[PDB]
mmCIF file of N, CA and C in Angstrom:
data_model
loop_
_atom_site.group_PDB
_atom_site.id
_atom_site.type_symbol
_atom_site.label_atom_id
_atom_site.label_comp_id
_atom_site.label_asym_id
_atom_site.label_seq_id
_atom_site.Cartn_x
_atom_site.Cartn_y
_atom_site.Cartn_z
ATOM 1 N N UNK A 1 11.168 6.821 -4.781
ATOM 2 C CA UNK A 1 10.410 5.577 -4.505
ATOM 3 C C UNK A 1 11.261 4.356 -4.828
ATOM 4 N N UNK A 2 11.909 4.396 -5.997
ATOM 5 C CA UNK A 2 12.701 3.275 -6.507
ATOM 6 C C UNK A 2 11.796 2.105 -6.847
ATOM 7 N N UNK A 3 11.633 1.849 -8.127
ATOM 8 C CA UNK A 3 10.735 0.796 -8.572
ATOM 9 C C UNK A 3 11.408 -0.564 -8.466
ATOM 10 N N UNK A 4 12.645 -0.561 -7.997
ATOM 11 C CA UNK A 4 13.416 -1.780 -7.878
ATOM 12 C C UNK A 4 13.234 -2.410 -6.500
ATOM 13 N N UNK A 5 12.867 -1.604 -5.507
ATOM 14 C CA UNK A 5 12.750 -2.112 -4.148
ATOM 15 C C UNK A 5 11.303 -2.183 -3.708
ATOM 16 N N UNK A 6 10.400 -1.944 -4.632
ATOM 17 C CA UNK A 6 8.985 -2.037 -4.332
ATOM 18 C C UNK A 6 8.364 -3.267 -4.995
ATOM 19 N N UNK A 7 7.650 -4.068 -4.201
ATOM 20 C CA UNK A 7 6.995 -5.275 -4.724
ATOM 21 C C UNK A 7 5.668 -4.934 -5.387
ATOM 22 N N UNK A 8 5.047 -3.856 -4.932
ATOM 23 C CA UNK A 8 3.766 -3.422 -5.474
ATOM 24 C C UNK A 8 3.436 -2.020 -5.005
ATOM 25 N N UNK A 9 2.999 -1.205 -5.938
ATOM 26 C CA UNK A 9 2.553 0.136 -5.639
ATOM 27 C C UNK A 9 1.036 0.223 -5.776
ATOM 28 N N UNK A 10 0.421 0.900 -4.827
ATOM 29 C CA UNK A 10 -1.010 1.068 -4.805
ATOM 30 C C UNK A 10 -1.392 2.493 -5.088
ATOM 31 N N UNK A 11 -2.264 2.636 -6.054
ATOM 32 C CA UNK A 11 -2.769 3.932 -6.434
ATOM 33 C C UNK A 11 -4.130 4.124 -5.811
ATOM 34 N N UNK A 12 -4.224 5.136 -4.988
ATOM 35 C CA UNK A 12 -5.431 5.403 -4.231
ATOM 36 C C UNK A 12 -6.434 6.115 -5.110
ATOM 37 N N UNK A 13 -7.713 5.893 -4.849
ATOM 38 C CA UNK A 13 -8.777 6.499 -5.643
ATOM 39 C C UNK A 13 -8.778 8.023 -5.470
ATOM 40 N N UNK A 14 -8.016 8.472 -4.483
ATOM 41 C CA UNK A 14 -7.890 9.887 -4.146
ATOM 42 C C UNK A 14 -6.730 10.500 -4.927
ATOM 43 N N UNK A 15 -5.889 9.625 -5.448
ATOM 44 C CA UNK A 15 -4.722 10.047 -6.189
ATOM 45 C C UNK A 15 -3.443 9.758 -5.450
ATOM 46 N N UNK A 16 -3.551 9.617 -4.138
ATOM 47 C CA UNK A 16 -2.398 9.333 -3.313
ATOM 48 C C UNK A 16 -1.892 7.934 -3.630
ATOM 49 N N UNK A 17 -0.666 7.636 -3.263
ATOM 50 C CA UNK A 17 -0.084 6.357 -3.613
ATOM 51 C C UNK A 17 0.616 5.698 -2.439
ATOM 52 N N UNK A 18 0.558 4.378 -2.416
ATOM 53 C CA UNK A 18 1.209 3.580 -1.396
ATOM 54 C C UNK A 18 2.148 2.589 -2.064
ATOM 55 N N UNK A 19 3.236 2.243 -1.412
ATOM 56 C CA UNK A 19 4.125 1.235 -1.957
ATOM 57 C C UNK A 19 4.517 0.259 -0.880
ATOM 58 N N UNK A 20 4.386 -1.017 -1.177
ATOM 59 C CA UNK A 20 4.893 -2.036 -0.290
ATOM 60 C C UNK A 20 6.285 -2.378 -0.764
ATOM 61 N N UNK A 21 7.257 -2.139 0.075
ATOM 62 C CA UNK A 21 8.635 -2.295 -0.316
ATOM 63 C C UNK A 21 9.124 -3.711 -0.056
ATOM 64 N N UNK A 22 10.146 -4.108 -0.793
ATOM 65 C CA UNK A 22 10.726 -5.438 -0.677
ATOM 66 C C UNK A 22 11.428 -5.602 0.669
ATOM 67 N N UNK A 23 11.607 -4.486 1.362
ATOM 68 C CA UNK A 23 12.226 -4.481 2.670
ATOM 69 C C UNK A 23 11.144 -4.632 3.717
ATOM 70 N N UNK A 24 9.907 -4.643 3.243
ATOM 71 C CA UNK A 24 8.791 -4.924 4.097
ATOM 72 C C UNK A 24 8.064 -3.697 4.617
ATOM 73 N N UNK A 25 8.650 -2.516 4.464
ATOM 74 C CA UNK A 25 7.978 -1.295 4.854
ATOM 75 C C UNK A 25 7.131 -0.755 3.712
ATOM 76 N N UNK A 26 6.522 0.392 3.943
ATOM 77 C CA UNK A 26 5.607 0.984 2.995
ATOM 78 C C UNK A 26 5.814 2.484 2.951
ATOM 79 N N UNK A 27 5.641 3.054 1.778
ATOM 80 C CA UNK A 27 5.773 4.484 1.617
ATOM 81 C C UNK A 27 4.541 5.069 0.976
ATOM 82 N N UNK A 28 4.081 6.192 1.490
ATOM 83 C CA UNK A 28 2.865 6.803 0.987
ATOM 84 C C UNK A 28 3.145 8.189 0.420
ATOM 85 N N UNK A 29 2.477 8.490 -0.678
ATOM 86 C CA UNK A 29 2.583 9.781 -1.330
ATOM 87 C C UNK A 29 1.188 10.308 -1.601
ATOM 88 N N UNK A 30 1.033 11.613 -1.706
ATOM 89 C CA UNK A 30 -0.263 12.187 -2.040
ATOM 90 C C UNK A 30 -0.427 12.263 -3.556
ATOM 91 N N UNK A 31 -1.644 12.570 -4.005
ATOM 92 C CA UNK A 31 -1.950 12.802 -5.429
ATOM 93 C C UNK A 31 -1.045 13.843 -6.119
ATOM 94 N N UNK A 32 -0.028 14.337 -5.431
ATOM 95 C CA UNK A 32 0.897 15.286 -6.021
ATOM 96 C C UNK A 32 2.311 14.723 -6.012
ATOM 97 N N UNK A 33 2.439 13.450 -5.636
ATOM 98 C CA UNK A 33 3.716 12.776 -5.728
ATOM 99 C C UNK A 33 4.624 13.109 -4.574
ATOM 100 N N UNK A 34 4.029 13.493 -3.458
ATOM 101 C CA UNK A 34 4.803 13.893 -2.296
ATOM 102 C C UNK A 34 4.622 12.941 -1.146
ATOM 103 N N UNK A 35 5.733 12.644 -0.523
ATOM 104 C CA UNK A 35 5.808 11.609 0.489
ATOM 105 C C UNK A 35 5.253 12.091 1.826
ATOM 106 N N UNK A 36 4.357 11.307 2.403
ATOM 107 C CA UNK A 36 3.779 11.613 3.703
ATOM 108 C C UNK A 36 3.457 10.324 4.452
ATOM 109 N N UNK A 37 3.449 10.398 5.778
ATOM 110 C CA UNK A 37 3.239 9.216 6.609
ATOM 111 C C UNK A 37 1.822 8.675 6.449
ATOM 112 N N UNK A 38 1.709 7.355 6.430
ATOM 113 C CA UNK A 38 0.421 6.693 6.305
ATOM 114 C C UNK A 38 -0.199 6.496 7.683
ATOM 115 N N UNK A 39 -1.409 7.029 7.885
ATOM 116 C CA UNK A 39 -2.116 6.944 9.165
ATOM 117 C C UNK A 39 -2.503 5.511 9.522
ATOM 118 N N UNK A 40 -2.039 5.050 10.675
ATOM 119 C CA UNK A 40 -2.372 3.715 11.149
ATOM 120 C C UNK A 40 -3.843 3.641 11.539
ATOM 121 N N UNK A 41 -4.467 2.507 11.260
ATOM 122 C CA UNK A 41 -5.838 2.300 11.679
ATOM 123 C C UNK A 41 -6.844 2.724 10.630
ATOM 124 N N UNK A 42 -6.379 3.417 9.607
ATOM 125 C CA UNK A 42 -7.262 3.892 8.557
ATOM 126 C C UNK A 42 -7.217 3.001 7.334
ATOM 127 N N UNK A 43 -8.377 2.501 6.950
ATOM 128 C CA UNK A 43 -8.502 1.738 5.724
ATOM 129 C C UNK A 43 -8.862 2.679 4.576
ATOM 130 N N UNK A 44 -8.120 2.582 3.487
ATOM 131 C CA UNK A 44 -8.316 3.464 2.348
ATOM 132 C C UNK A 44 -8.497 2.657 1.075
ATOM 133 N N UNK A 45 -9.079 3.285 0.065
ATOM 134 C CA UNK A 45 -9.368 2.607 -1.187
ATOM 135 C C UNK A 45 -8.406 2.998 -2.292
ATOM 136 N N UNK A 46 -8.362 2.144 -3.289
ATOM 137 C CA UNK A 46 -7.538 2.362 -4.456
ATOM 138 C C UNK A 46 -8.421 2.565 -5.678
ATOM 139 N N UNK A 47 -7.845 3.070 -6.760
ATOM 140 C CA UNK A 47 -8.583 3.230 -8.010
ATOM 141 C C UNK A 47 -8.982 1.888 -8.579
ATOM 142 N N UNK A 48 -8.310 0.872 -8.099
ATOM 143 C CA UNK A 48 -8.459 -0.467 -8.625
ATOM 144 C C UNK A 48 -9.547 -1.225 -7.866
ATOM 145 N N UNK A 49 -9.928 -0.690 -6.710
ATOM 146 C CA UNK A 49 -11.041 -1.251 -5.972
ATOM 147 C C UNK A 49 -10.596 -2.112 -4.816
ATOM 148 N N UNK A 50 -9.348 -1.951 -4.411
ATOM 149 C CA UNK A 50 -8.817 -2.676 -3.275
ATOM 150 C C UNK A 50 -8.877 -1.788 -2.038
ATOM 151 N N UNK A 51 -8.932 -2.398 -0.866
ATOM 152 C CA UNK A 51 -8.885 -1.649 0.376
ATOM 153 C C UNK A 51 -7.653 -2.055 1.163
ATOM 154 N N UNK A 52 -6.966 -1.064 1.702
ATOM 155 C CA UNK A 52 -5.714 -1.285 2.408
ATOM 156 C C UNK A 52 -5.666 -0.471 3.698
ATOM 157 N N UNK A 53 -4.829 -0.907 4.626
ATOM 158 C CA UNK A 53 -4.590 -0.157 5.867
ATOM 159 C C UNK A 53 -3.242 -0.537 6.468
ATOM 160 N N UNK A 54 -2.618 0.415 7.142
ATOM 161 C CA UNK A 54 -1.361 0.172 7.826
ATOM 162 C C UNK A 54 -1.650 -0.031 9.303
ATOM 163 N N UNK A 55 -1.328 -1.202 9.812
ATOM 164 C CA UNK A 55 -1.573 -1.505 11.208
ATOM 165 C C UNK A 55 -0.415 -2.299 11.776
ATOM 166 N N UNK A 56 0.082 -1.861 12.922
ATOM 167 C CA UNK A 56 1.183 -2.545 13.578
ATOM 168 C C UNK A 56 2.439 -2.606 12.727
ATOM 169 N N UNK A 57 2.723 -1.518 12.005
ATOM 170 C CA UNK A 57 3.913 -1.422 11.147
ATOM 171 C C UNK A 57 3.786 -2.374 9.945
ATOM 172 N N UNK A 58 2.606 -2.938 9.780
ATOM 173 C CA UNK A 58 2.329 -3.837 8.671
ATOM 174 C C UNK A 58 1.349 -3.200 7.702
ATOM 175 N N UNK A 59 0.983 -3.945 6.675
ATOM 176 C CA UNK A 59 0.036 -3.472 5.694
ATOM 177 C C UNK A 59 -0.997 -4.555 5.393
ATOM 178 N N UNK A 60 -2.252 -4.211 5.607
ATOM 179 C CA UNK A 60 -3.375 -5.042 5.218
ATOM 180 C C UNK A 60 -3.668 -4.780 3.755
ATOM 181 N N UNK A 61 -3.521 -5.802 2.943
ATOM 182 C CA UNK A 61 -3.996 -5.733 1.585
ATOM 183 C C UNK A 61 -5.145 -6.715 1.478
ATOM 184 N N UNK A 62 -6.358 -6.174 1.527
ATOM 185 C CA UNK A 62 -7.593 -6.946 1.797
ATOM 186 C C UNK A 62 -7.382 -8.076 2.838
ATOM 187 N N UNK A 63 -6.258 -8.015 3.571
ATOM 188 C CA UNK A 63 -5.840 -9.030 4.550
ATOM 189 C C UNK A 63 -5.556 -10.400 3.922
ATOM 190 N N UNK A 64 -6.492 -10.904 3.144
ATOM 191 C CA UNK A 64 -6.395 -12.256 2.594
ATOM 192 C C UNK A 64 -5.300 -12.375 1.537
ATOM 193 N N UNK A 65 -4.822 -11.243 1.032
ATOM 194 C CA UNK A 65 -3.677 -11.243 0.128
ATOM 195 C C UNK A 65 -2.422 -11.611 0.895
ATOM 196 N N UNK A 66 -2.464 -11.336 2.179
ATOM 197 C CA UNK A 66 -1.400 -11.716 3.092
ATOM 198 C C UNK A 66 -1.656 -13.124 3.604
ATOM 199 N N UNK A 67 -2.937 -13.458 3.706
ATOM 200 C CA UNK A 67 -3.376 -14.772 4.151
ATOM 201 C C UNK A 67 -2.841 -15.874 3.237
ATOM 202 N N UNK A 68 -3.307 -15.889 1.993
ATOM 203 C CA UNK A 68 -2.933 -16.943 1.057
ATOM 204 C C UNK A 68 -2.509 -16.363 -0.284
ATOM 205 N N UNK A 69 -2.228 -15.073 -0.290
ATOM 206 C CA UNK A 69 -1.844 -14.402 -1.518
ATOM 207 C C UNK A 69 -0.341 -14.280 -1.668
ATOM 208 N N UNK A 70 0.393 -15.170 -1.013
ATOM 209 C CA UNK A 70 1.846 -15.186 -1.130
ATOM 210 C C UNK A 70 2.258 -16.013 -2.336
ATOM 211 N N UNK A 71 2.765 -15.334 -3.350
ATOM 212 C CA UNK A 71 3.109 -15.973 -4.605
ATOM 213 C C UNK A 71 4.610 -15.927 -4.857
ATOM 214 N N UNK A 72 5.286 -14.977 -4.210
ATOM 215 C CA UNK A 72 6.698 -14.705 -4.473
ATOM 216 C C UNK A 72 6.859 -14.206 -5.906
ATOM 217 N N UNK A 73 6.736 -12.900 -6.071
ATOM 218 C CA UNK A 73 6.704 -12.315 -7.392
ATOM 219 C C UNK A 73 5.354 -11.693 -7.681
ATOM 220 N N UNK A 74 4.534 -12.392 -8.450
ATOM 221 C CA UNK A 74 3.208 -11.905 -8.754
ATOM 222 C C UNK A 74 2.728 -12.391 -10.101
#
């Protein structure tokens, strides 16, 4: 995964994990730490209570986090 090239990792309520990379892509793993492709068009939940989806090679993070949630860092 490399924690150096990821801006934020998302832990799914299912155990699976998503990472938004500093290169702009995203990587998904299952509750067993194994890498698998993230299904486009599907909105999924996190343990933290956020909803996310991969659409058009992008990532919706409640959408509005992309809207006005640009902080540069966090």
